[PDB]
Amino acid sequence: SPIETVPVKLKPGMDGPKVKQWPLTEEKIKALVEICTEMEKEGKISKIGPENPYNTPVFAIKKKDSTKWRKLVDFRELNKRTQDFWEVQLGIPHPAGLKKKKSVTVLDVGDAYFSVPLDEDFRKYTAFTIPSINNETPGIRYQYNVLPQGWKGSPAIFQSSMTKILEPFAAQNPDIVIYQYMDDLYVGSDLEIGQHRTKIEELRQHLLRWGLTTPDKKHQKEPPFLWMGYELHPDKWTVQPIVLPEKDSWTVNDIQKLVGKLNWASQIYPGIKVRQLSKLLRGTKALTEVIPLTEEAELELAENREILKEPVHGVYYDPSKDLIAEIQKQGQGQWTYQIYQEPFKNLKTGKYARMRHTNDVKQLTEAVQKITTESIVIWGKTPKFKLPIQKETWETWWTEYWQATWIPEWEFVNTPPLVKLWYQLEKEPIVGAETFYVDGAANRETKLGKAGYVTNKGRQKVVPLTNTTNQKTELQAIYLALQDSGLEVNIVTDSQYALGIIQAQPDKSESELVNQIIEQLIKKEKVYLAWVPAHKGIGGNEQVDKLV
Amino acid sequence: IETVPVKLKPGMDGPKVKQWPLTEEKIKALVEICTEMEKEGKISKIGPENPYNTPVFAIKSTKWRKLVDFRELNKRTQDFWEVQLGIPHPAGLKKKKSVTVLDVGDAYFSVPLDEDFRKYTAFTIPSINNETPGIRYQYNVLPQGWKGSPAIFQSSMTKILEPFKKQNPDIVIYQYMDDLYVGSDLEIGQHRTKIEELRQHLLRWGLTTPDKYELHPDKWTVQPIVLPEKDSWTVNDIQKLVGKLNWASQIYPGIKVRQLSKLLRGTKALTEVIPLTEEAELELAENREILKEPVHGVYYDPSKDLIAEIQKQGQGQWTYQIYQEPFKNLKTGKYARMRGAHTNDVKQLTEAVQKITTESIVIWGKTPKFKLPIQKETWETWWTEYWQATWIPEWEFVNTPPLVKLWYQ
Numbered sequence: 001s002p003i004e005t006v007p008v009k010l011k012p013g014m015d016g017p018k019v020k021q022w023p024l025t026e027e028k029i030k031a032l033v034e035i036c037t038e039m040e041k042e043g044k045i046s047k048i049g050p051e052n053p054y055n056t057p058v059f060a061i062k063k064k065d066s067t068k069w070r071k072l073v074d075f076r077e078l079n080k081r082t083q084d085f086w087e088v089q090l091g092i093p094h095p096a097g098l099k100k101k102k103s104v105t106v107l108d109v110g111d112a113y114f115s116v117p118l119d120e121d122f123r124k125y126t127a128f129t130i131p132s133i134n135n136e137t138p139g140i141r142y143q144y145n146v147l148p149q150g151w152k153g154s155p156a157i158f159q160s161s162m163t164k165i166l167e168p169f170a171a172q173n174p175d176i177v178i179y180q181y182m183d184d185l186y187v188g189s190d191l192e193i194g195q196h197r198t199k200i201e202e203l204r205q206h207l208l209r210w211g212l213t214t215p216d217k218k219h220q221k222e223p224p225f226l227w228m229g230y231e232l233h234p235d236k237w238t239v240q241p242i243v244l245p246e247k248d249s250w251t252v253n254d255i256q257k258l259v260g261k262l263n264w265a266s267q268i269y270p271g272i273k274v275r276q277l278s279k280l281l282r283g284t285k286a287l288t289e290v291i292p293l294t295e296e297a298e299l300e301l302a303e304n305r306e307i308l309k310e311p312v313h314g315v316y317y318d319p320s321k322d323l324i325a326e327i328q329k330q331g332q333g334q335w336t337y338q339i340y341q342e343p344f345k346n347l348k349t350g351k352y353a354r355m356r357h358t359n360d361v362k363q364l365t366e367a368v369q370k371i372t373t374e375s376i377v378i379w380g381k382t383p384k385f386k387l388p389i390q391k392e393t394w395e396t397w398w399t400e401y402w403q404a405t406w407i408p409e410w411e412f413v414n415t416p417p418l419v420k421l422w423y424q425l426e427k428e429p430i431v432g433a434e435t436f437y438v439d440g441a442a443n444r445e446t447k448l449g450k451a452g453y454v455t456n457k458g459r460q461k462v463v464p465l466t467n468t469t470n471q472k473t474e475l476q477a478i479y480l481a482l483q484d485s486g487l488e489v490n491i492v493t494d495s496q497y498a499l500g501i502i503q504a505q506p507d508k509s510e511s512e513l514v515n516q517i518i519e520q521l522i523k524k525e526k527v528y529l530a531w532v533p534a535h536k537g538i539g540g541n542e543q544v545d546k547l548v
Numbered sequence: 549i550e551t552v553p554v555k556l557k558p559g560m561d562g563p564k565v566k567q568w569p570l571t572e573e574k575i576k577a578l579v580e581i582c583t584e585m586e587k588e589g590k591i592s593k594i595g596p597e598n599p600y601n602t603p604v605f606a607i608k609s610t611k612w613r614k615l616v617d618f619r620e621l622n623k624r625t626q627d628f629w630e631v632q633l634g635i636p637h638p639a640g641l642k643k644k645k646s647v648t649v650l651d652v653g654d655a656y657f658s659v660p661l662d663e664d665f666r667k668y669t670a671f672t673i674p675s676i677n678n679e680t681p682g683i684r685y686q687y688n689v690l691p692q693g694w695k696g697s698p699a700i701f702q703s704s705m706t707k708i709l710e711p712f713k714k715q716n717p718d719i720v721i722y723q724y725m726d727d728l729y730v731g732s733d734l735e736i737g738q739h740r741t742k743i744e745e746l747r748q749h750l751l752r753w754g755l756t757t758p759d760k761y762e763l764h765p766d767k768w769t770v771q772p773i774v775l776p777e778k779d780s781w782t783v784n785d786i787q788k789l790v791g792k793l794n795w796a797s798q799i800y801p802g803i804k805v806r807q808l809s810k811l812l813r814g815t816k817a818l819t820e821v822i823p824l825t826e827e828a829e830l831e832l833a834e835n836r837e838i839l840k841e842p843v844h845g846v847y848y849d850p851s852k853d854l855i856a857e858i859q860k861q862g863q864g865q866w867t868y869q870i871y872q873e874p875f876k877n878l879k880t881g882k883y884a885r886m887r888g889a890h891t892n893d894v895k896q897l898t899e900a901v902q903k904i905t906t907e908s909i910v911i912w913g914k915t916p917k918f919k920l921p922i923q924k925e926t927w928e929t930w931w932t933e934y935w936q937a938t939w940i941p942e943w944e945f946v947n948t949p950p951l952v953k954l955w956y957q
């Protein structure tokens with residue numbers, strides 16, 4: 001090949017791989033010779049002298065039980081010693097970000113790696129040896145002239161080689177769009193079908209001039225294109241058919257696969273939920289352990305089965321039209337969103353869920369962040385948001401919130417459920433309201449505890465608790481004060497834990513106690529929570545500590 | 549001239565950081581800028597045999613400016629290039645009355661970079677939706693943002709500055725990265741004319757400064773803690789007071805709250821007005837007096853990194869503390885900003901971070917690691933919008949909210 005080679009080094013302080021060549025059966029050696037003679041005939045490999053001190057294992061494997069064999073070289077020992085390269089493409093283009101082209105062609109190049117030469121000085125490190133029968137004769141020495149399959153450098157080097165090869169044609173054809181990906185090229189254009197096919201054949205001839213084969217017949221792939229779990233159709237994109245298995249028993253592996261398929265499907269099928277099914281996966285135990293399906297998980301899975309009944313599709317992107325993203329709440333801390341330019345067509349869909357006390361507004365903002373990141377990645381811009389929240393609500397939240405938040409352009413969309421502030425603590429103490437000095441305490445060993453309160457009106461109470469912690473008693477005290485007070489109450493605690501949890505103003509939690517506390521807070525008119533140093537004998541707090 | 553050889557720390561490989569996704573606008577700006585820089589020889593395109601990577605961003609003016617995040621490369625080079633070619637830091641810069649910051653980055657672009665080091669300056673212009681692998685460059689000359697650049701240009705800078713220095717022996721000049729900090733005690737007018745004299749001097753010696761920023765570090769001090777002053781006091785007020793004083797006892801030993809604690813002996817309502825006694829008022833007086841004085845035994849440690857904590861106070865105000873060990877504040881302060889139908893939280897936070905970082909540079913000659921009150925991804929998304937600096941401090945994102953919010957107000 002006239003292609004310019006890329007200079008490759010071994011890792012500093014390392015030498016070429018000197019690895020044993022273990023004997024093979026007669027047929028394997030025969031097939032190896034049969035293949036290597038033809039590879040040598042095409043200049044892909046070359047026999048070498050006894051001077052080469054390195055070596056690399058070689059195996060022979062049948063192909064799908066067929067006539068032609070296949071040569072397999074384990075370069076894992078050489079790969080350790082070769083330098084690092086530019087990291088190859090991590091992610092892939094998302095169909096929602098593609099733009100409609102009147103024509104799209106798939107061109108797969110064969111012998112992609114063997115069609116690109118290897119740096120000369122590095123070729124000696126890829127040396128391997130074909131063994132002889134019973135070691136009665138010297139082995140046949142060989143080395144690669146081109147990019148070996150399974151070598152560390154082959155993908156990146158082939159990538160840059162392809163890019164450099166495409167540069168001229170790309171220059172002489174600015175109105176056509178070529179996408180590169182592994183062994184494939186994807187060429188789109190708005191040219192008329194005849195002109196487009198002409199340009200395609202032109203490209204094919206160019207690539208062939210650079211030694212790269214490409215389908216000669218009417219191109220092997222036609223729409224729809226089954227690509228990376230996607231179905232790419234001329235005017236729409238969707239996912240490949242999802243199959244949800246029917247089983248009486250479910251292991252960790254099966255649930256993981258299921259959550260996989262559901263997540264994968266969630267990018268275009270609106271409403272998919274995975275919280276309850278992945279909540280089964282909290283157990284980090286063995287992958288073969290059979291996990292019993294809960295009722296909530298069963299209901300969830302059933303609802304997903306209902307959603308996946310009829311197929312749904314996504315459209316392609318139009319730069320000339322606005323980019324809109326709308327968010328809806330699903331109730332269980334789950335959120336779903338649609339990204340679209342048109343009313344009945346989604347560009348794509350998605351979900352957000354908060355893992356590891358929180359409130360709706362904060363979660364909403366987090367979702368907005370996720371969608372913003374995704375939008376930037378896919379289309380290179382940020383979407384206009386449609387959100388179920390009042391301006392006064394969100395402003396009230398972000399003003400008094402301890403973290404700094406970025407609130408983008410958004411308009412109110414009145415679609416229940418709505419995000420609102422269910423309750424709000426008083427900023428100043430309440431005149432004409434009873435003052436509950438509360439406290440709670442437990443034993444780290446016996447797990448026996450007690451929570452109580454003392455009020456300025458002379459009212460006192462102590463409630464015993466079993467199987468608890470200091471924290472849970474510290475919350476239980478506040479809960480008690482809330483239970484035994486009027487619509488307006490001044491609570492005073494020494495616990496900065498409890499104060500912290502409550503001042504965050506959550507509307508949901510994975511703790512039933514906190515949920516009850518939240519219920520009480522919603523049911524109240526005014527609630528002022530104050531804090532004082534424990535064991536400082538301030539008074540008011542001392543009697544409650546003495547009690548419990 | 550022949551290039552200054554640049555070596556890494558033994559055992560350390562080059563930087564391999566991910567490139568952040570960018571808006572189409574910013575990507576186009578970077579493509580433009582890098583096309584021009586490639587045209588001028590400053591950078592060249594590289595192959596797949598270059599594994600290293602350094603993030604790039606686009607900031608601002610009405611003209612897009614490119615900003616390289618060389619933090620990683622700095623930790624992998626300058627840590628041995630603050631030793632070898634290190635730049636000393638004057639302790640008299642903070643004592644001057646007026647300090648102006650000049651941009652002298654454009655100098656570095658004249659000087660070539662060590663051939664064997666260029667591969668570590670690799671950066672990637674990203675593509676939208678992973679369409680193309682990305683445009684890969686490396687620097688051929690001294691890059692802005694790299695701490696090795698002003699270290700290599702150090703001698704040249706000294707040589708150019710020497711005449712002006714001789715004509716102005718009372719002016720302090722300290723170079724941090726791409727910036728020249730010029731401090732004097734002169735009158736504001738005389739100061740600005742002097743800065744302009746330095747501008748013309750530098751310009752007629754071949755150094756352009758795109759200024760065609762004023763600080764006052766003589767007023768900078770560790771702010772004293774303020775106790776609430778009220779005519780009458782309620783139970784709640786005395787509770788907040790005793791609490792705050794008890795918190796302050798972590799810093800000032802000698803704080804007593806017994807006389808104030810006995811004042812709320814009975815279990816009373818939070819809105820009940822309580823008169824102050826003799827022992828109580830005397831205790832408050834003694835506590836205020838001991839609180840007015842600065843802390844004893846607080847010194848800067850050159851072997852320890854600086855830590856900056858910021859907390860949001862609302863109403864367009866932020867408060868910050870700079871320390872090295874807990875409750876040993878080297879420098880506190882409060883950054884406030886006029887809204888004027890302009891500012892939001894992230895803008896204020898960013899400007900705050902820049903102000904704090906500049907103060908930190910002026911005082912100690914290095915930057916603090918911030919604990920920022922903001923969601924990580926939000927910051928990583930929008931921090932480049934109001935960033936006017938050329939350096940980038942280290943940062944991490946605080947998890948739990950502070951209950952100590954009103955204690956710094």
Ligand SMILES: N#Cc1ccc2c(Oc3ccc(F)cc3OCCn3ccc(=O)[nH]c3=O)cc(F)cc2c1
Binds near residue numbers: 099104178179189225
């Ligand atoms: N196998 C495979 C395969 C085939 C086409 C692809 C593609 O295609 C495109 C290639 C270049 C371009 F400019 C625009 C494309 O897609 C715009 C959307 N679209 C898509 C398919 C179609 O039949 N019609 C159509 O309008 C873009 C892409 F990332 C990956 C592709 C992978």
Ligand SMILES: [Mg+2]
Binds near residue numbers: 439494534535
């Ligand atoms: Mg107590």
